[PDB]
Structures are given as C-alpha cells and as structure tokens.
Amino acid sequence: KSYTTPKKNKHKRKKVKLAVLKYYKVDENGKISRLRRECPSDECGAGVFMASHFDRHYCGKCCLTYCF
Amino acid sequence: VNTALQEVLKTALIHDGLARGIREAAKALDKRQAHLCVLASNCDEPMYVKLVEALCAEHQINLIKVDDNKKLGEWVGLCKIDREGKPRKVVGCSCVVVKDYGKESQAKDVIEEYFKC
Numbered sequence A: 001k002s003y004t005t006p007k008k009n010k011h012k013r014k015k016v017k018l019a020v021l022k023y024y025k026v027d028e029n030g031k032i033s034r035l036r037r038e039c040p041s042d043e044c045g046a047g048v049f050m051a052s053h054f055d056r057h058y059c060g061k062c063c064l065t066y067c068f
Numbered sequence B: 001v002n003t004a005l006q007e008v009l010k011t012a013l014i015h016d017g018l019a020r021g022i023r024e025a026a027k028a029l030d031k032r033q034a035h036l037c038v039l040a041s042n043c044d045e046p047m048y049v050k051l052v053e054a055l056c057a058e059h060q061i062n063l064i065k066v067d068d069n070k071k072l073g074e075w076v077g078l079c080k081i082d083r084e085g086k087p088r089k090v091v092g093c094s095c096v097v098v099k100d101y102g103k104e105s106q107a108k109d110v111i112e113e114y115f116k117c
C-alpha cells in the first residue's frame, strides 16, 4: 500500500501528435532544411536524431557532449 | 496487381522486409534503402501531404496512390488482433517504405516490369 510519503513520478513519454514535421523544415522547393545536427561517428548514422538543448548537444548513444 | 502488392507486403512482413514507420522511413531514406513505398491520397491530412510527397519523390522512389490512411495499416498490420475475421479496434499509419530481400517471386516480375516502365 501507501505511506505518508508521496510517491515519486517518472519521466513518461508524453503523447505529441505529428512531430515528424518537426524533423525537417518543409520549404517550397524540394530541398531538405534541417535545424538539428547529427552524430558524426560511424556507430550511429544520420538517421538517428539528437537532443535539442539550448547551449550543449548530445549524440545518439555515444554520450559525446558537443559544446562550444 | 493489388493481390501482387498484398503478397509482396505480406512476405515483407514475414521476413521483416518492410521498414514500417515514418521514423524508419526517415532512417531508410537517409541510408537510401527505399525499394518501394505506398502513399495514401485524398485524405484529411492538414499539411503532411507536401512533406510526404517530397519524401516519396526524393531519390529513386516510386509514386503509389491508395485511398485511405487506416486501411493501409491493415495491409501492414498495426492492429492484427482477432485474425479469424474483421479487426474491431484499429489505429492507422500514414506510409510504409520497404527494403525487399527475397525479390525472386512470382508476380514480382510484372511488379518490376511496371516499375521500370
């Protein structure tokens, strides 16, 4: 059962509808425009996308923190 | 030829030939492993039609038109429960790209004949 202490929440994947158009910027001419970077290593390809932070960056599985 | 596409997609389901999902569609188009894909036309898509036409006409990808979104998932099998008859709880998918391995088949000859010309 439960104690007096409240239970701890967990990071669940929230349901967002049609986020695939957030991958590339859909322009007029048929050329893909991208706002994100990729992982330049050969372990993960460009099909794997990255974590969009504001100053630092994250690879797919390599955990390589790309900073300025 | 609808039975031919059904046989090709079912064999892709058997041998995991098809790369289902718009996520895996982006993976396959990034790695250039797009043998074929099926696109639903005249649907209620708000703005996805231009992006998916750009994906379907990017680099050596055929243009295939079907009628509705959720009936495409019946071919690819999102909610294949109660296989004895009509499924009663089905959500749908937009498009499915394939990566065919066992290309030597019966009707795949006329499929690639229509694909070349």
Ligand SMILES: [Zn+2]
Residues within 6 Å of the ligand: A039, A040, A041, A043, A044, A059, A060, A061, A062, A063
């Ligand atoms: Zn990596």
